[PDB]
Amino acid sequence: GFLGAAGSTMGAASMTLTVQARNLTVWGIKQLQARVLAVERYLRDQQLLGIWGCSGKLICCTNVPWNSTWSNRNLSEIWDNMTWLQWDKEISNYTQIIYGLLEESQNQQEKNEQDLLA
Amino acid sequence: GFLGAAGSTMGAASMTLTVQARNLLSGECQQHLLKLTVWGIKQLQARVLAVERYLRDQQLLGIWGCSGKLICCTNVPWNSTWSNRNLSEIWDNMTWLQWDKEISNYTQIIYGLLEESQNQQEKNEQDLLALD
Amino acid sequence: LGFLGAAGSTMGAASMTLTVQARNLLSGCQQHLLKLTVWGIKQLQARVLAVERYLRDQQLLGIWGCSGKLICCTNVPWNSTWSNRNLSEIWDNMTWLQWDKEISNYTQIIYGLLEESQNQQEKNEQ
Amino acid sequence: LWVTVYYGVPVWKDAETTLFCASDAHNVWATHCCVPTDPNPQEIHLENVTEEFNMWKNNMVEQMHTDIISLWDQSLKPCVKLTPLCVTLQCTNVTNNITDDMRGELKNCSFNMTTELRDKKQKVYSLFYRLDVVQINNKEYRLINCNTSAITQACPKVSFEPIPIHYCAPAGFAILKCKDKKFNGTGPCTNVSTVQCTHGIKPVVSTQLLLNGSLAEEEVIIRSENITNNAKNILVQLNESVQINCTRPNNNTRKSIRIGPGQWFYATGDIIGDIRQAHCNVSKATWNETLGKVVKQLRKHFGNNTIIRFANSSGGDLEVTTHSFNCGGEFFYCNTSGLFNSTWIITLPCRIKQIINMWQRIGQAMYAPPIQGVIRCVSNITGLILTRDNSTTETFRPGGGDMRDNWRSELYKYKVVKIEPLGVAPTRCK
Amino acid sequence: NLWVTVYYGVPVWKDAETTLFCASDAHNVWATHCCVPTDPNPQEIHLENVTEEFNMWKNNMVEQMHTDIISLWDQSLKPCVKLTPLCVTLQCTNVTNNITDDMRGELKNCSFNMTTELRDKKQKVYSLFYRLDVVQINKEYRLINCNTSAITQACPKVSFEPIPIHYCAPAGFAILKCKDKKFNGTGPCTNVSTVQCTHGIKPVVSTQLLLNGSLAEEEVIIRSENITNNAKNILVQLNESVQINCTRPNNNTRKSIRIGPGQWFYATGDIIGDIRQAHCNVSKATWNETLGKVVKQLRKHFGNNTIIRFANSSGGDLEVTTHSFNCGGEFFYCNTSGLFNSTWISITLPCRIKQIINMWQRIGQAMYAPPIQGVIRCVSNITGLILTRNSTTETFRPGGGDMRDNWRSELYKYKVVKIEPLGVAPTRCKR
Amino acid sequence: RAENLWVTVYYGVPVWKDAETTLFCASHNVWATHCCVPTDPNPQEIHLENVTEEFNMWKNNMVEQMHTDIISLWDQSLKPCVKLTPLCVTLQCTNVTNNITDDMRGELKNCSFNMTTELRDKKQKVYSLFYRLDVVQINNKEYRLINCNTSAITQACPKVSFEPIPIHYCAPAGFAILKCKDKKFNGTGPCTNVSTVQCTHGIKPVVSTQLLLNGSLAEEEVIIRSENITNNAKNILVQLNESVQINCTRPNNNTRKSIRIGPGQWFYATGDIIGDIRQAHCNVSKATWNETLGKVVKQLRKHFGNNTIIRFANSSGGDLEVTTHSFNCGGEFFYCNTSGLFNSTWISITLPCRIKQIINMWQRIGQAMYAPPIQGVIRCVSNITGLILTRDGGSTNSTTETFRPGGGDMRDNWRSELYKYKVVKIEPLGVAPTRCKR
Ligand SMILES: *[C@@H]1O[C@H](CO)[C@@H](O[C@@H]2O[C@H](CO)[C@@H](O[C@@H]3O[C@H](CO)[C@@H](O)[C@H](O[C@H]4O[C@H](CO)[C@@H](O)[C@H](O)[C@@H]4O[C@H]4O[C@H](CO)[C@@H](O)[C@H](O)[C@@H]4O)[C@@H]3O)[C@H](O)[C@H]2NC(C)=O)[C@H](O)[C@H]1NC(C)=O
Ligand SMILES: *[C@@H]1O[C@H](CO)[C@@H](O[C@@H]2O[C@H](CO)[C@@H](O[C@@H]3O[C@H](CO[C@H]4O[C@H](CO)[C@@H](O)[C@H](O)[C@@H]4O)[C@@H](O)[C@H](O[C@H]4O[C@H](CO)[C@@H](O)[C@H](O)[C@@H]4O)[C@@H]3O)[C@H](O)[C@H]2NC(C)=O)[C@H](O)[C@H]1NC(C)=O
Ligand SMILES: *[C@@H]1O[C@H](CO)[C@@H](O[C@@H]2O[C@H](CO)[C@@H](O)[C@H](O)[C@H]2NC(C)=O)[C@H](O)[C@H]1NC(C)=O
Ligand SMILES: *[C@@H]1O[C@H](CO)[C@@H](O[C@@H]2O[C@H](CO)[C@@H](O)[C@H](O)[C@H]2NC(C)=O)[C@H](O)[C@H]1NC(C)=O
Ligand SMILES: *[C@@H]1O[C@H](CO)[C@@H](O)[C@H](O)[C@H]1NC(C)=O
Ligand SMILES: *[C@@H]1O[C@H](CO)[C@@H](O)[C@H](O)[C@H]1NC(C)=O
Ligand SMILES: *[C@@H]1O[C@H](CO)[C@@H](O)[C@H](O)[C@H]1NC(C)=O
Ligand SMILES: *[C@@H]1O[C@H](CO)[C@@H](O)[C@H](O)[C@H]1NC(C)=O
Ligand SMILES: *[C@@H]1O[C@H](CO)[C@@H](O)[C@H](O)[C@H]1NC(C)=O
Ligand SMILES: *[C@@H]1O[C@H](CO)[C@@H](O)[C@H](O)[C@H]1NC(C)=O
Ligand SMILES: *[C@@H]1O[C@H](CO)[C@@H](O)[C@H](O)[C@H]1NC(C)=O
Ligand SMILES: *[C@@H]1O[C@H](CO)[C@@H](O)[C@H](O)[C@H]1NC(C)=O
Ligand SMILES: *[C@@H]1O[C@H](CO)[C@@H](O)[C@H](O)[C@H]1NC(C)=O
Ligand SMILES: *[C@@H]1O[C@H](CO)[C@@H](O)[C@H](O)[C@H]1NC(C)=O
Ligand SMILES: *[C@@H]1O[C@H](CO)[C@@H](O)[C@H](O)[C@H]1NC(C)=O
Ligand SMILES: *[C@@H]1O[C@H](CO)[C@@H](O)[C@H](O)[C@H]1NC(C)=O
Ligand SMILES: *[C@@H]1O[C@H](CO)[C@@H](O)[C@H](O)[C@H]1NC(C)=O
């Protein structure tokens, strides 16, 4: 219902992204501060998608390949017989590099857009 | 023409959109107001709420695949349980307020259907890319 | 290759790296300061203001049809009154800082043109 | 056939939000906000609608009330308190060149007040008005509010003259307005338009009489929530104003008295010249002419054949039974009985009081320090408030008092809604 | 030959700390505090195949509840009357009229010179005090807190009944709960769900005996941070409720003394009828059996054949040696030593009444409780115990004082995490 | 009909403009508990290759930010402390006459008074010692405190120190802090060695007058700066390239007594001094001083010519807080006589110091703060890093000119520390001419 697929396989969870995607006295200042933070967290994730050319997509396909050093696994090892919580922990080492790679793939295409239209 | 609408025909709602959607983020001596902690906090939180409302619409249009559109088509059929009007009067001759009025009772379900339509479309796109 | 250390590069070269700068606006005990009922609000205001500015710029790109891209293209020709230089003269032998001050009075006018051009483009598509 | 999403629709709903304070740029209302008014306010003629308005349910009135109190409190909150003066007083009568009509109103009181040192006293005396002093048990007197509340001093460096303030909507909101002239107050008017900014309203605090407000354009307008229920008040907006001239009688001075380590009290000092009674002058004809118009507008609701009488008010608190008027922070309490003594088909004596309570929040009193010399107070009567006291006769008497009536009266034609730009309809497109 | 795809809305999370919203059922201090209604029918979603590690001893929301309950209490008192002018030399006597023998000297009838609404006038008044709050100098007495700090008066209209409050997560966060029976306080639980908010928890403050909280459901459950060590407390939930009936039987009146320019002091008035000691009744028929159950569970940790003794408290102040109980605004200090006398292998607890009361043992601010007129009878449930600690025998004694454990004892089954919707995964697609 | 140039637009442009914003502080005492944000443990600096930028220390808002925050902390920390209102009573004072050096005669007054106890109906007769600077004569044994006819006074809390712990200021996202790395920066103009940082280095919030203590030292030569050098009415800020050590002491062995003046309100009264009575003073190497100044004149001559003789003069006018060197160490407040420090011209110096306990901060008239007594004796060693001077000229005499010690406006102290810094905001969007047409 909220995290209904949390214990499931990547395959099973593939159609549930919309489920998570949408869930966003002086004393009361604390609640305001929390609201402000939630907005800020939201926006940084949205920017990252935009700069990767993933604006508007839940499942964005890019031009960056997978390395065997990030994941030494195949289809029945990654999607099946696996769950997102564990898997994400398993590859946490490469989060930063992938993001840098995604930015570069986008930059390389945009330059070819202004020119190639010409 | 900030709200130069009122309603006549829906064709008129197209031309007013840029302004209506822009008005949301309109974008000095306020130093002495910082100390007014009650007066000032109300004004501040109000700004925050305005931001939330803006984002709520953008996010919803985004999930529906309507971002960047003024008019958004999708493969979700209209139901006789929602309305029974022809397609002539309801644009060309009917104003908008009645449209807000009768359709007000049922809406959520529509939003869920719009989301599902996109959910299915994107998975199909991924397969089309994987295949031929 | 650094953060604002492109400022001295020609505009063309500087433009090769935009993401670094693009993300700079969206980032960011710790209890003692909660008693500062005036100071703490100022800090809250500061971050709220930063958010509004970020969003304002994004909305403009939306209006102009340039959203979702760091770099976009439009249908508005250049007006020699804003500046009168050739292409090489601008992309090379030029810092963005200089460029910006040279055309600092021709900004809002372009924005108006961009908005109407995009409005007409939508009218043409409908 | 198909569901399509639309945006930019002319749709709105009732809402409660926070409005901005805008002004024209050293006063309660001068250093209280920074937003400039719109130098050229625009109006959107949001016509071809019959928008339902109310005024008895107006969210704007409630925030005006809340915020004016807050502003008032912010002004007084940091100012010196008068606790050291809540002592037994030794008083006698001021009979020096006294008009008999004012006899007994001004008192000469002395007391033992501390000095800047914790171990020393000073003998101090000042003058008081009778309305602020109570006899203990003929020499011993008390400040009237020592048994009820703390009293603070309004700071003499703060002006209290009202300024028109414009309210402005936040983005995503709009204020709907009637351009009608004969609007009931709760009707579905046809003259509908919308604004981001209201007409500025100068806050006015007064009782039994609406001063410095707007006038009706076509006729005298009578409004109430329920005319039938005597519990509701009656408010009248005149289409012509009436001039009223109120003045001080006496060229008074004041004394700056050291009361503590950085604290000062500003006492009423003696009077230059002879003692005279405070009063207000209104044209007798104008008042009679104005009433005639008002009555003709009552008959249309109460019957052409009934007898209409105006009468002296009920008993009650000073702020209820007399006309309470703020002139530069000084308060006049004018006897209006002479204005309501007629049935058909001018000098008002005024009392002066310095220990005053605003908006009936019993508990927080304030002392109004004196203004030097004689001043003139001149204002525009734009309306008033009455109550309803067989079928033979109908009698009306002065009402109001509750400040929400002054604000509501001025905010006659405005409503607040929120904008809802998204919607969904059937069409032909897949 | 797999390529990168970015997935948004992935159902994963990590440990986190944030601000929670308070909510209620819609002049009680917590009624005016929470202006948010709860979900009329709160949601809970079972998470199939999710194992999650919880740790009640490191549960950060506990710190938040403790901090906020303090903030609110204190805020409640901030705008109330200060009693500084009443810190005077007192003239007191032995009012022992119509009393039982154990009350001989419990009350002091004191009189003094104090202010009136005018600075230059004085009045003589008198009132009754409990000896716990009055100290003899070398007839001459002083209030007990005159040599420590300021004393203020609670506002008489404000009540403190512990109306249950629910805590709800902000967007981007989620509350995880263990529905796993016999949850051990720490470690992975394998029966979990995600919830919008916690259930309502009553902000009951006590020492030694935990009142009106959650039950253990299946058996008595003993939890501690470290079982081996004796430097840690032990928190025990009972599955059965134990009923306790408390009273202060004397019919008291109140008087209102004008003390100054615009305010009042609420003084102890007179007493109607005989004076008897305050006390609490625990049925022996339940308590005996209750400890036997506790011991049976202790045998799972300490040999299986040891002799377990219950005993009185260690030395300490009133707050920890007696049971601290509040009802109706009055503070009872009940002698529980006879509640912990037996060794394993009706009960009347006399109670003292204190009026000038430190709260949460944080030194600086003394609050004066106005008297409650009439008599009082309170009935409540003991739902748990706070206990502290040779190859053949061990002894247990009552504990308390650190209120964070009371909060901890209800919140032991909850965890807060943040949602991290962006994931990256391979696919047979390139573009 | 045209060459067909087309407007284009893009985001991520390295352009900034001057902006005024609020920077935040990063780092038991007043500064530590209010600067909870840690500094970046690994600070960065990015040189802006081939970039020139203009800085102006005289129009710097970072200075104003320091001023406001330094005031705010003083008020925030004194606000909750014991008020000393009840001490404004008639005092009966005599001279302390026991083992007093001649120079200290009349400096210490032994005053007795009737004070409030913890109970409303009880009084106590107490006494303590005061410095004469805090007490005034009534009409001859009858005295009162100097603040009785002006304002309330608050006792500083004994547990809150005001040690000048260095703090850093750091930009919020969207802003950048720029600095000059260049040399001989005039305080104004287009320095070329420019870089930006996330956060500045730490700056010690040292408060002083006349002599600027514990600041940065110049790289190689004395630098003289003024908003207007040729305006004799303006302050001249001089940064030295060699520090001068100064050794200060308060030799009297003090004690304290603590008296209840209410329910939990402890007044810290001066305890008797045990031992002989001596003057507080500072020791400056005589040679170092009559070495270090030679280069000051040499550099003054860069603006005034080296055919003029420059004199350093004493007895600059103003109040105690202006004419003496305002020094605060250990929480003790010293008023050091520097007249012999500025009595020389050309082609170990002991400076006596007075002590005052009733003190005012940043010339905020009508509010005061009592400096509690300190146990024992003190010793402080500090670095003289710069001077605040004014010209005594304007006369028709170019042959000789005199300068005198100046200052008192604390913003100039911070201005010197903030000399090299500026703040701008980032504006990532821009427009330029492009071949592509949508
Ligand atoms: C220029 O820089 C120099 C160098 O930093 C500055 O001079 C230094 O100033 C500090 C503070 O005055 C001084 O530090 C004290 O040295 C004493 C040596 O005997 C220590 O005994 C003393 O310790 C106390 O304070 C500590 C605070 O951290 C406590 O942790 C410690 O337990 C002590 O606390 C007792 O005493 C205090 C009162 O002093 C009392 O409140 C407590 O309750 C408790 O009883 C400090 O460590 C340095 O020694 C000085 N160094 C030099 C060379 O002089 C100089 O001031 C700067 N110049 C300017 C203008 O700012
Ligand atoms: C564990 O949980 C139990 C169950 O809730 C708690 O027991 C309650 O304790 C409160 C606090 O003492 C009781 O509240 C009081 O009840 C009085 C009796 O009410 C009846 O009789 C009067 C007679 O005049 C009728 O008017 C009324 O309708 C009822 O029939 C009330 O008189 C009290 O109100 C007065 O005092 C308060 C003081 O603050 C004032 O504010 C009020 O205005 C008024 O003057 C009050 O409501 C409650 O009745 C008990 N419930 C039950 C079922 O017994 C335990 O206290 C709790 N344990 C712990 C440790 O928290
Ligand atoms: C939790 O684990 C169980 C057990 O593996 C899952 O049950 C399977 O559900 C699918 C539904 O299409 C059936 O085809 C399988 O035969 C079931 N497995 C077994 C052993 O019977 C359950 O779906 C999992 N839940 C989540 C959220 O992942
Ligand atoms: C109504 O408005 C008039 C005009 O502003 C007020 O009378 C003036 O008040 C100002 C306030 O500074 C004085 O400077 C003028 O001299 C006054 N004009 C006169 C006395 O002729 C009047 O007080 C307002 N009335 C009310 C009830 O607020
Ligand atoms: C600075 O200019 C030189 C040429 O003088 C050039 O070689 C160098 O790359 C430039 N540096 C930058 C800003 O890239
Ligand atoms: C001041 O006090 C004295 C002594 O009680 C009394 O005689 C005198 O009348 C008082 N003076 C005033 C002005 O109240
Ligand atoms: C007009 O206002 C009066 C005043 O109470 C009310 O009685 C009457 O019903 C209103 N009429 C309508 C429907 O506008
Ligand atoms: C008020 O005073 C003016 C003169 O300033 C006079 O002309 C006018 O008639 C007076 N009005 C009334 C009602 O007294
Ligand atoms: C005064 O009232 C009487 C009685 O109604 C009327 O006849 C007369 O004309 C009125 N005078 C004025 C000036 O209106
Ligand atoms: C009343 O309003 C009119 C404008 O309609 C103005 O000319 C006149 O001066 C005002 N009179 C008073 C006393 O404010
Ligand atoms: C009040 O003060 C007088 C002073 O003479 C003393 O005799 C009396 O006993 C005091 N009364 C009380 C109740 O303390
Ligand atoms: C269960 O609780 C005991 C303490 O009673 C502790 O030592 C043990 O590690 C806990 N088990 C787990 C899985 O955390
Ligand atoms: C006490 O326990 C009984 C039985 O479990 C339950 O019905 C009752 O509601 C409980 N009362 C309180 C205050 O917890
Ligand atoms: C424990 O039990 C013994 C035997 O009945 C009794 O004498 C003693 O007083 C009891 N102690 C307590 C604290 O109840
Ligand atoms: C106290 O010392 C001063 C010098 O500061 C002296 O003038 C005065 O006469 C002395 N007092 C007495 C009583 O001798
Ligand atoms: C340095 O500042 C002074 C201020 O009086 C100015 O006259 C001089 O021209 C400046 N020098 C440079 C190199 O900018
Ligand atoms: C100051 O200079 C004068 C000469 O004008 C000299 O007599 C005196 O001793 C000098 N004093 C100091 C402290 O240097």
PDB file of N, CA and C in Angstrom, chain D residues 83-84 86-88 140 146-150, chain E residues 117-121 258 260-264:
ATOM      1  N   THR D  83       3.832  50.215  37.774  1.00  0.00           N
ATOM      2  CA  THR D  83       3.603  49.589  39.063  1.00  0.00           C
ATOM      3  C   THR D  83       3.950  50.476  40.268  1.00  0.00           C
ATOM      4  N   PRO D  84       5.090  51.210  40.311  1.00  0.00           N
ATOM      5  CA  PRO D  84       5.507  52.046  41.420  1.00  0.00           C
ATOM      6  C   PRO D  84       4.495  53.106  41.817  1.00  0.00           C
ATOM      7  N   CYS D  86       1.170  52.519  42.131  1.00  0.00           N
ATOM      8  CA  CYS D  86       0.007  51.877  42.731  1.00  0.00           C
ATOM      9  C   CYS D  86       0.146  51.904  44.259  1.00  0.00           C
ATOM     10  N   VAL D  87      -0.054  53.113  44.763  1.00  0.00           N
ATOM     11  CA  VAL D  87       0.082  53.475  46.158  1.00  0.00           C
ATOM     12  C   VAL D  87      -1.133  54.212  46.635  1.00  0.00           C
ATOM     13  N   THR D  88      -1.278  54.317  47.932  1.00  0.00           N
ATOM     14  CA  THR D  88      -2.342  55.124  48.478  1.00  0.00           C
ATOM     15  C   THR D  88      -2.059  56.590  48.166  1.00  0.00           C
ATOM     16  N   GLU D 140      -7.979  59.548  51.496  1.00  0.00           N
ATOM     17  CA  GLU D 140      -7.310  58.392  50.915  1.00  0.00           C
ATOM     18  C   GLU D 140      -8.011  57.891  49.669  1.00  0.00           C
ATOM     19  N   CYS D 146      -5.890  49.262  40.499  1.00  0.00           N
ATOM     20  CA  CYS D 146      -4.937  48.504  41.345  1.00  0.00           C
ATOM     21  C   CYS D 146      -5.512  47.172  41.825  1.00  0.00           C
ATOM     22  N   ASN D 147      -6.821  47.066  41.898  1.00  0.00           N
ATOM     23  CA  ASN D 147      -7.413  45.809  42.336  1.00  0.00           C
ATOM     24  C   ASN D 147      -7.703  44.840  41.166  1.00  0.00           C
ATOM     25  N   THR D 148      -7.429  45.245  39.898  1.00  0.00           N
ATOM     26  CA  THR D 148      -7.736  44.490  38.692  1.00  0.00           C
ATOM     27  C   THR D 148      -6.535  44.128  37.868  1.00  0.00           C
ATOM     28  N   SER D 149      -5.659  45.077  37.614  1.00  0.00           N
ATOM     29  CA  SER D 149      -4.595  44.791  36.684  1.00  0.00           C
ATOM     30  C   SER D 149      -3.355  45.620  36.792  1.00  0.00           C
ATOM     31  N   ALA D 150      -2.316  45.123  36.152  1.00  0.00           N
ATOM     32  CA  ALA D 150      -1.109  45.886  35.981  1.00  0.00           C
ATOM     33  C   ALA D 150      -1.404  46.992  34.991  1.00  0.00           C
TER      34      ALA D 150
ATOM     35  N   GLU E 117      -2.523  44.761  47.263  1.00  0.00           N
ATOM     36  CA  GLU E 117      -2.450  45.409  45.960  1.00  0.00           C
ATOM     37  C   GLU E 117      -1.738  46.750  46.003  1.00  0.00           C
ATOM     38  N   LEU E 118      -1.570  47.346  47.185  1.00  0.00           N
ATOM     39  CA  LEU E 118      -0.870  48.617  47.228  1.00  0.00           C
ATOM     40  C   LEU E 118       0.470  48.435  47.835  1.00  0.00           C
ATOM     41  N   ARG E 119       1.413  49.134  47.269  1.00  0.00           N
ATOM     42  CA  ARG E 119       2.782  49.041  47.705  1.00  0.00           C
ATOM     43  C   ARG E 119       2.973  49.478  49.151  1.00  0.00           C
ATOM     44  N   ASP E 120       2.166  50.426  49.617  1.00  0.00           N
ATOM     45  CA  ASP E 120       2.322  50.910  50.964  1.00  0.00           C
ATOM     46  C   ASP E 120       1.380  50.292  51.986  1.00  0.00           C
ATOM     47  N   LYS E 121       0.759  49.165  51.656  1.00  0.00           N
ATOM     48  CA  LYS E 121      -0.111  48.498  52.614  1.00  0.00           C
ATOM     49  C   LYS E 121       0.335  47.066  52.836  1.00  0.00           C
ATOM     50  N   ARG E 258      -5.321  38.022  47.765  1.00  0.00           N
ATOM     51  CA  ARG E 258      -4.899  39.023  46.817  1.00  0.00           C
ATOM     52  C   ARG E 258      -3.468  39.325  47.174  1.00  0.00           C
ATOM     53  N   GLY E 260      -1.207  41.301  44.999  1.00  0.00           N
ATOM     54  CA  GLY E 260      -0.589  42.397  44.327  1.00  0.00           C
ATOM     55  C   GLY E 260      -1.494  42.972  43.256  1.00  0.00           C
ATOM     56  N   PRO E 261      -0.969  43.889  42.454  1.00  0.00           N
ATOM     57  CA  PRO E 261      -1.668  44.642  41.453  1.00  0.00           C
ATOM     58  C   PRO E 261      -2.077  43.779  40.287  1.00  0.00           C
ATOM     59  N   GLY E 262      -3.226  43.142  40.464  1.00  0.00           N
ATOM     60  CA  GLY E 262      -3.787  42.284  39.451  1.00  0.00           C
ATOM     61  C   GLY E 262      -3.644  40.790  39.645  1.00  0.00           C
ATOM     62  N   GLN E 263      -3.208  40.305  40.808  1.00  0.00           N
ATOM     63  CA  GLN E 263      -3.143  38.849  40.869  1.00  0.00           C
ATOM     64  C   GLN E 263      -3.385  38.222  42.229  1.00  0.00           C
ATOM     65  N   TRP E 264      -3.369  36.886  42.221  1.00  0.00           N
ATOM     66  CA  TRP E 264      -3.745  36.090  43.373  1.00  0.00           C
ATOM     67  C   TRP E 264      -2.858  34.911  43.665  1.00  0.00           C
TER      68      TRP E 264
END
